Structure formats: structure tokens, C-alpha cells
């Protein structure tokens, strides 16, 4: 036997910062989860029980602290290219650094119309996520996403026209709930290094935006003939909207309500035009993805 | 042995009901989760196996869905009065109804600005509940609370003046990160039945308002003591504006974030006046509760 | 406004133990959660900042991990009534100690048929619990249990002559699947302090292993006429069995298994007699409590 | 832009069956959660809005089901690889399926130590896995494994003579608590079709015992110089007893375990060769993989 590949790294490594405005007083904090785990030339601490080639994982922790010590944390597209970075130069024999990093929301509050100095929110579990892989001699790639975005529209979709067999038993409709949570994740292309990293900064937060704006207002305003055509909508537009983006990928459960018929109750009408209570379900559900990139 | 005690019921009944303003074209949501225990003259079900005293707990789940579609669904402590009330007064051997409803939130999207009519957006798991005991010749107590309300301030919370002994090894602090998830609850004077709830209607949605803005202005702007001293704050205020309110429960974990020595590398400073990058800690927390009542 | 109820402390507190035989070379793990809240005369904490009345929640963390370094952790109702008798014997101003200990399992491992000296699993989330309260001048109250035990039998359990009303729709069955998750408490006699806990020392975990034991036959033996009649069943046994215990409850969800009707398909038969495949409910649920005593 | 790759279907389906042994009364249950995803030619739902091309994920649900009543579901190789199958030959624009099966456990109890005929446990989380790809014109593809298998020993694991530099802080050690949750998936070769899976029926059962019982005895008895090493030896074994195995995947985290220094208090020693209260630590967490193949 032999090895075929190998990783190993920390994961789970909560980091918060703080940045304190001497002028003004304003303070502004970030917090994130972190994982990175390495590649290289490490196949004899599998086979040999040879640790001399081991960074510990220890070590990768510290060295997260140290880096968000003496680097700015956003946007993190940016952090974790530096940090991938530092890996590979850093240890000859280490080649590759993943380093994926989920962003909290600590948003700033409002106390009587105004923003406070320095208190701050959870407002929604919706997450701002990268990935960068660092690989030595072939770049830098950067996966950037948003996930936990949980939304419902309460008409304006519809679902007719599908295919109709003898395992089919769903109802066509034109007119129900649609309700998901998205996970949207754009690609960008391929960057040289830090150097060019940084001379694209300004563009990942106004991306990240844009993503999310698109996301919202074409869910919002589609007069939806399914998931997947909805979802193909959102996708071209945000290819169209920044050339560095190489493909747009999503995937979107379809969180099911149901009908209640409720006519052997005294005849009570809850179905089709005067549905007004649903049973949401937990499970199953349907699950639609589809990656978009250029023609 | 004897049955001292017995309730059952349905849990987990997940609920959603739409109203559509038939003029506007505005349409509404409204998404819970309720549970219904009943007590009574039941004590045989379970030592005779006598099912004729048993309302099948499917039944129960019915009787929610039947009372959702005839009433209105808020504010929450009307529609747990109605739902408890009905199983009193249908049979004639149940005595007190047990109704918690948990209260999701779908807030209406702005799309260019604009509030769109049938779109919503899941804005943080925060919640909105009520506790609503019906009880035979006993009238009505409801309990209103809002949960999983999740705040951090990066600066004025100090922790000093504790008592030490050879337990102890804390530092006091005059400046600290306080963060943690609320969970506060208000009860109300004992109703006499539906029609004195019914009277009282507005006061229960400007009530939620008013203990949601208390606790927040007041987290915000205490210089806090301890979470003691702020949270008694919190309690005093709700007391003083609603004179229907005859108790406010606090209940608050210590969500610690540490301090990160760094100094054995290269005598990097990240301590007290220097520090910006700490470790949020998963566990343990301090866990501080209190219930504030008139004198 | 005034304080009516107060209590704070540490939640969270996971420890682990482990004791090794010096003789045998066998070892033994022992790993919990455990939260105290303390209570007594420290109301000026809330109402006047006074701080001093405060052990901070930090220095109760250190007494558990002390009071687990120099006693026995087991069993769990032993280790709770000693840190709990610590805090009123050692403050004099607080006179209530809340101690909660979850226990997780870590079962020996059997390696080619025989036991292993350092090698454990976790055989399942199946908890044992105990509540202690420790009040000054009123004794030691204890409440053990089991939690997470699930179990589901095929068939041997019916549900038949409940009460039919326009609100039913449940048909009668005299052959289901009955599946819960059990949650069982026994609340011993008040013991008078620590010198009587110690003398019942054995009664601990026999008792906890006869609950076990009578839940599991009981469950599995018992053609079951409703989830309320077999628990009762069970609660009468465990009071029989150990004279110390004053009462028993039960707290047992119904999760439901519905069958699925595939008739529409070529008339494939998957009902009544013929049913095979059936569709497991995440939610609602049935919830069945019970509390029985000695009459 | 364009459509890159798209899959869609249904996830989150509970299943449960039951068989009966009309001769012995025995009775045996299944439970397990599957996802199907469909790929071919689809794109016009997606761009065109053209839902001639899609097969329902409603209809796929029912499909899972009507698969189940008529087919064995053990191994659970064999029924994904018949699922999976189905698709492709039943859509003649269908060309890939990919099926996920989840097995939860459901152990026979022991009653007065005999085994019931109709009672069952859940005991523990551990999950039992596959995930078969379906490809027309590529045969079928069936990776196997093992997760939620949670161990730790309390002796017999070291780790030192790693990497030292300026951002080390870990002391090496001779003598540490070594505690994981083991994921674990075997890769079989390629096969032509459905003929070819059924004719190695019987290798599936015996390998996934194969693969548990050398993981289990493996961590029990390695005296390990680090998870890499250990971990390498366990997939070494596996490959080395089924042939027709092409690669063993591993994925475990290190959950960490940390002494407690007490020597602040009363000099107490809880250290090295006198540690015996740790404090499990929820995070971060190592975590090391490796897959290993044929040389
Ligand atoms: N860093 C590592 C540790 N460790 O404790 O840091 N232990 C291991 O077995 N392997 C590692 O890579
Ligand atoms: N409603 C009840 C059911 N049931 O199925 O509805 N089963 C029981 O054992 N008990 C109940 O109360
Ligand atoms: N122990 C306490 C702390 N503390 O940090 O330990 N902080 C508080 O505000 N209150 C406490 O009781
Ligand atoms: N099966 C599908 C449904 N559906 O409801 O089954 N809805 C969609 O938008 N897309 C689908 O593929």
C-alpha cells in the first residue's frame, strides 16, 4: 500500500478581533471560524512514524492568532490568501494550504435612530464563507459564498408542466409557497499571488453585495416557473455584473408547505383559492443545484 | 401507587397561515410552533386502560389547525387563550389546558427600497413566545417572552469587587467584551377568562416591543457593574411601564471571550490595553438569573 | 421593584477522571457536565452594583474541578450532594446550592473477547442525570434519571376506544409501531445531609440499573394499550422495588410511523396486514407524562 | 453564459420496513435516510423553463418508496446500486444517478438474556453509509463507510519529535488521552452493472465488519506515535484482507483533552505522572485525513 494523499491541519478555531477608531471612538468587531489544513511532503509521519515533517497542529492554531494579530481580518478573501500564504513559504516541504473561513454577523445597533459606538447584534445566522487554496507554483484559488440565507415567498411561483408517469402523483399548480435557504458560491479566476490579490481588494466586498442583492431581488420579483429556472436567472446575472468570476454555483432546497384539507370539518374550506393555513414540513425536501459559467 | 400527576398532548405542530389583503394586494405570514397539554379526570387511561377518557393527541393537532383557520393567529397570547379555552369548554372532564407557541420570524423584504408585498426574509432565530395555562375556575395566566436575542459589547462592562478566597483565581477587569443570548419573559396579572384578555389585546404586542427596546438601549449604554446589576436595570424599566406586568425573569449566560497571551513570540503585545484578537470560548459560561416583582 | 428569586453560577463545566489501578493496570474514565447555581443573600449584587456578596462564577468552575481532584465522582448523586454541601458550609451567606451532573458513557471496550484496560466507546447518547438541591437547614434533596434511551418496538402495541368527536379523524388499530425516547426521574426521600447520603451509597446505582432494566423488560413485554398504560406499568414496578423513592415520572414522546398507501401504483398492497414500508414522522409528536407516588 | 453541470432530486427521505418471518414470528427493521440527484439532459429547465425534461422530485420520493416495498434494502450497496438503476433505464435523458443511503441503528434487544423478536434499541449515533453513482456507459460506483464511531484511551498515545519553531508552543509528551470520532470509506472497483454488484452480494456485510473490527482493535492496541501513524495501519489491514477494494479514505479529528493545573491551590498536583481531572475541550480540533491505495 502507499499513500495516495494526505492532509492534515486545525479546524474549528474561533477568532475574534477588535479595531478601536482613536478619533472618533467608534470600535468595530469581526468574528470568524477558521480551519486550515496542509499538503506537502508529509507521507513518512503516515508511513514511518516520522514527526520531523510535521507542523503541529498546535502551531497552525497559534499561527492563525499571530496572523490576525498583524493583518487586517477583512475582507476575508484577503486574510485567508495571507494566511495560505505564510504556510507555504514558510516550510519547504509544505506545498498546498486550504484555508476556508466562516464569517459571523456582529452587526452595529441602532439606539434611538442612531449607531452605537461600539454594540453589536446577531442579526440572522446568514453566513459570508471563502475558500482559498494555496498551491505552491500554480497560484491562488478563491471560492467566496453565502449561506444561510432563509427566505419565503408566499405566491408568485408556480410548478406545472413536468413530466407525468406512473410514479407520478403531484398535482400541477400555478400558484404555491416557495421557500429556501441559499447557498450561493461564486468562483473567481485564478490569481498569481499575494500581489495580485491585493490589487483586486476593493472588489470581493462589492461582490459579495452584489451576489446577495441579485439573490433577493430576483427571488423577490421572478414570477417563478421552477426552482431551477429562478435559480439560472439569479446566476446570469452576477456572471454579467464582474468579469473575475469565473462560474456561479447554487443550491436551494425547496422547504415543502402543504395544503390542510380541512372539508370533513363541517365543510371548511382551506384548499387551492382559499388555502390559508399549511403544514410546513421538516423533511423531505427538494433539492435543486446548477453551476453557470461563461459561454 | 397512585397517579399524583398526568398531562398530555401534541408537541412540534408546526403551523403557518397567510393573510392577503384582498385590496392591497399585501399578503401577510405568520409561522409557530405550538405544543398542547391537557389535564384532567384522566387518571384511569393510564392505571385501567381506559382510552374513553383520551382526546387522541391526533386529535389535538386537528383542533389546532381547525382554531388557526377560524381566528385571528396574533398577537400570541389571544390565540393560546382561544386554543386553551376551547378544551375546557368542550369536555366537560378536562380541566386545564397547557399552550406554548413559539413564534418564528418572516419579515417583509425591501426590494429598491420599497416593502414588497409576498416576500419575507428569515432575520435572525431570535423568538417570540407565550406560555398560556387555562386552568378550570381558575381563569387564565400567560406568560410573554422573547429568546435567543443574541448581543455583544466590545467595551464598558467592568468586574470588579468580587469576593476572593483560595478558590479564586479571576482577575478584576474595568474593561471587558460582554456578550450574551437574551431570554426574558414577562408575566401577566391572572385574566378572568377570554373576554378580559380580548380587552387587553393591544397592550400584548406594545409590551414585546417595549421589553425588546428596554433591553437593548439599556445593554448598549450601562457602563455594566456585572450582569447583575445590568439586568435588574433591564427589570425595573419594564415594570415601570406596564402596570398589567406583575413579574420580569431575567435569564442571561456569560458568553466569555479570553484574552490571548502572545508575548513568547517575538514579545508581541496582546494583552489589556494591547489586546484585539481574543478566543470566544464554546464553554463553560456563567449562567446569571433573576426575578424582579413590585414591593 | 424588588428581587423575588435570584440564582447564578456556572453552566457547561465538562470534566473528565480517570482512575488507574496500580496493581492490575486497569483504568476507568469518567466524563460529565455539570452546572451549579448558587443562591442565598446576595441580592445587592443586582440593586446596588455590590459585588462583594459575588464568588464569581469563574472560582465555582475551580471548585468543581478541586472538588472532582480529591472525591469520588461516582455515582453522580454522591459527587453532587458533596459540592453542593461545600458552598453552604463554606459561604455563610449563600444557602442554596442547584448542582446538575450529566453523565456520558464510556463503555469498555471488548477486544477479541475480552475487556480492554484503557480502551473505551461511547455506546450511544443514553444519559443518567441527577438534580441536587443542597438547602441550608432543610436537607438534600436528589433527583436521578436516565434520558436518551430510544427504543421502538414492530408490533404488540394498540389504539383502540378513545373518544370519537368531530374533531377526529384517527382511525382504531389493534397492531402499530410504538418508538420513544424515554425519560425516567425517581425522587429519592429527603436525606438530612451528607452522613446519610454516604450510608446509602449502594442503593445509587442499583437503583438506576433496576429503572433500566424495568423500562427495557416493561417496554418490550407489554401488549401495549396506549403509551399512558404502559408507562404507568413501569412507574408502579421501580416504586415497588426500592422503598426509599417517593415518585417516578415519566416523560415518553410518541414518534410516529405512518403507513404509506402505494396503491395508485399498479394496486400494490402496503396497508393493514400487507403493510411493509413505512414513513418515519419528524414532527408532531405525542407527548405523555406522568407522575405516580405511593397512595 | 452556460449551463456548467446541474443535479437535482430529493433529499432528507426517511424510510423505514419491516420484515416478518411467517415461520418463527421473528421480525427485523430497517431505517435508514436517502438522497437521490439526477443528472442528463436538463439544461432547458434550467434556461428555457422547459419542465417537459424533469422528472418531479416528488416523484423520485414515491419512486424510493415503491423501490423499497419491492427489493431488499441489505446491504444497503445493493439497494442503492438498484435505485440508482432505475433511473437510468426507466429516462432515456437521464444519464447519471446518485444515490446517498444513511443506515441508522436499530440493535435487537436482550431481554432475561434472549434476544426479542420485536423490540429494538438505538444504540448509538454510529451511522453505517453509502454512496453509489450510477453513470450509463461507466458502470456503477460504490463507496461504503462508517461514521459516528466516537473512542478514546486514556494511556498509550504519544506524540513528540515534531517540528520546533518560533511558533511552537506544545510540549512533547510520552504519555496523552487520545480521543476521535472515526470516519471511515472504502472505495470498490468499478462495476460493469447490476449483475456484477449482486454476484459480490455477500463481500458487503463481511467488509464493512472488517473494516469496524480492525478500526476498533487497531486504536485499542497501537501504541501510537501520532494519528497519521495509527490511522495508516488501520487502512494498511483493511486493504490488505478484500481484494476488490481499490482505496481506504480516513478522516479523524484529535478531541482534545487538557490537564488542569491545581498547584495554585494548596500546592495540588494534577500534572503528568499525578494528572486525573482533565478538561475536555469542544474546540478547536485536530483533524487528519489520508486516503491510501495499492502500490
Ligand atoms: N498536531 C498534531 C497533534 N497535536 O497534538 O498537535 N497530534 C497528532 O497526533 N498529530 C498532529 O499532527
Ligand atoms: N393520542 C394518543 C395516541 N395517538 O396515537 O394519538 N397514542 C397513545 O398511546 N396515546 C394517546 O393519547
Ligand atoms: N462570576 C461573574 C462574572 N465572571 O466573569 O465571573 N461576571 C459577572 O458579571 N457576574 C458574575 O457573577
Ligand atoms: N420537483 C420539483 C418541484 N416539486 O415541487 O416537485 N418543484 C421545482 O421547482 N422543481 C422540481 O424539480
Same mark, same amino acid.
Given at each position: 500500500?502507499?499513500?495516495?494523499?494526505?492532509?492534515?491541519?486545525?479546524?474549528?478555531?474561533?477568532?475574534?478581533?477588535?479595531?478601536?477608531?482613536?478619533?472618533?471612538?467608534?470600535?468595530?468587531?469581526?468574528?470568524?471560524?477558521?480551519?486550515?489544513? !496542509? %499538503?506537502?511532503?508529509?507521507?513518512?509521519?503516515?508511513?514511518?512514524?516520522?514527526?520531523?515533517?510535521?507542523?503541529?497542529?498546535?502551531?497552525?492554531?497559534? /499561527?492563525?492568532?499571530?496572523?490576525?494579530?498583524?493583518?487586517?481580518?477583512?475582507?476575508?478573501? !484577503?486574510? =485567508?490568501?495571507?494566511?495560505?500564504?505564510?504556510?507555504? %513559504?514558510?516550510? #519547504?516541504?509544505?506545498?498546498?494550504?486550504?484555508?476556508?473561513?466562516?464569517?459571523?454577523?456582529? /452587526?452595529?445597533? @441602532?439606539?434611538? =435612530?442612531?449607531?452605537?459606538?461600539?454594540?453589536?447584534?446577531?442579526?440572522?445566522?446568514?453566513?459570508? #464563507?471563502?475558500?482559498?487554496?494555496?498551491?505552491? =507554483?500554480?497560484?491562488?484559488?478563491?471560492?467566496?459564498?453565502?449561506?444561510?440565507?432563509?427566505?419565503?415567498?408566499?405566491? #408568485?411561483?408556480?410548478?406545472?408542466?413536468?413530466?407525468?408517469?406512473?410514479? /407520478?402523483?403531484?398535482? %400541477?399548480?400555478?400558484?404555491?409557497?416557495?421557500?429556501?435557504?441559499?447557498?450561493?458560491?461564486?468562483?473567481?479566476?485564478?490569481?498569481?499571488?499575494?500581489?495580485?490579490?491585493?490589487?483586486?481588494?476593493?472588489?470581493? @466586498?462589492?461582490?459579495?453585495?452584489?451576489?446577495?442583492?441579485? /439573490?433577493?431581488?430576483?427571488?423577490?420579483?421572478?414570477?417563478?416557473?421552477?426552482?431551477?429556472?429562478?435559480?439560472?436567472?439569479?446566476?446570469?446575472?452576477?456572471?454579467?455584473?464582474?468579469?473575475?468570476?469565473?462560474?456561479?454555483?447554487?443550491?436551494?432546497?425547496?422547504?415543502?408547505?402543504?395544503?390542510?384539507?380541512?372539508?370533513?370539518?363541517?365543510?371548511?374550506?382551506?384548499?387551492?383559492?382559499?388555502?390559508?393555513?399549511?403544514?410546513?414540513?421538516?423533511?423531505?425536501? =427538494?433539492?435543486?443545484?446548477?453551476?453557470?459559467?461563461?459561454?
Amino acid at each position: 500500500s502507499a499513500v495516495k494523499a494526505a492532509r492534515y491541519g486545525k479546524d474549528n478555531v474561533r477568532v475574534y478581533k477588535v479595531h478601536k477608531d482613536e478619533k472618533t471612538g467608534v470600535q468595530t468587531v469581526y468574528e470568524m471560524t477558521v480551519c486550515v489544513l !496542509l %499538503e506537502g511532503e508529509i507521507e513518512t509521519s503516515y508511513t514511518k512514524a516520522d514527526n520531523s515533517v510535521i507542523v503541529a497542529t498546535d502551531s497552525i492554531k497559534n /499561527t492563525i492568532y499571530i496572523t490576525a494579530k498583524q493583518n487586517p481580518v477583512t475582507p476575508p478573501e !484577503l486574510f =485567508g490568501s495571507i494566511l495560505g500564504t505564510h504556510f507555504i %513559504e514558510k516550510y #519547504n516541504h509544505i506545498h498546498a494550504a486550504h484555508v476556508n473561513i466562516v464569517c459571523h454577523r456582529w /452587526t452595529r445597533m @441602532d439606539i434611538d =435612530g442612531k449607531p452605537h459606538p461600539h454594540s453589536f447584534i446577531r442579526d440572522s445566522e446568514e453566513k459570508r #464563507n471563502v475558500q482559498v487554496d494555496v498551491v505552491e =507554483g500554480k497560484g491562488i484559488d478563491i471560492k467566496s459564498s453565502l449561506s444561510g440565507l432563509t427566505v419565503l415567498k408566499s405566491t #408568485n411561483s408556480q410548478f406545472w408542466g413536468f413530466l407525468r408517469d406512473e410514479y /407520478t402523483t403531484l398535482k %400541477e399548480t400555478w400558484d404555491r409557497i416557495l421557500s429556501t435557504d441559499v447557498d450561493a458560491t461564486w468562483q473567481w479566476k485564478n490569481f498569481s499571488g499575494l500581489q495580485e490579490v491585493r490589487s483586486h481588494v476593493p472588489k470581493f @466586498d462589492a461582490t459579495w453585495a452584489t451576489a446577495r442583492e441579485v /439573490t433577493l431581488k430576483t427571488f423577490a420579483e421572478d414570477n417563478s416557473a421552477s426552482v431551477q429556472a429562478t435559480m439560472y436567472k439569479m446566476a446570469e446575472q452576477i456572471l454579467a455584473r464582474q468579469q473575475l468570476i469565473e462560474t456561479v454555483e447554487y443550491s436551494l432546497p425547496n422547504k415543502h408547505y402543504f395544503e390542510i384539507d380541512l372539508s370533513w370539518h363541517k365543510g371548511l374550506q382551506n384548499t387551492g383559492k382559499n388555502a390559508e393555513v399549511f403544514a410546513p414540513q421538516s423533511d423531505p425536501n =427538494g433539492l435543486i443545484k446548477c453551476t453557470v459559467g461563461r459561454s
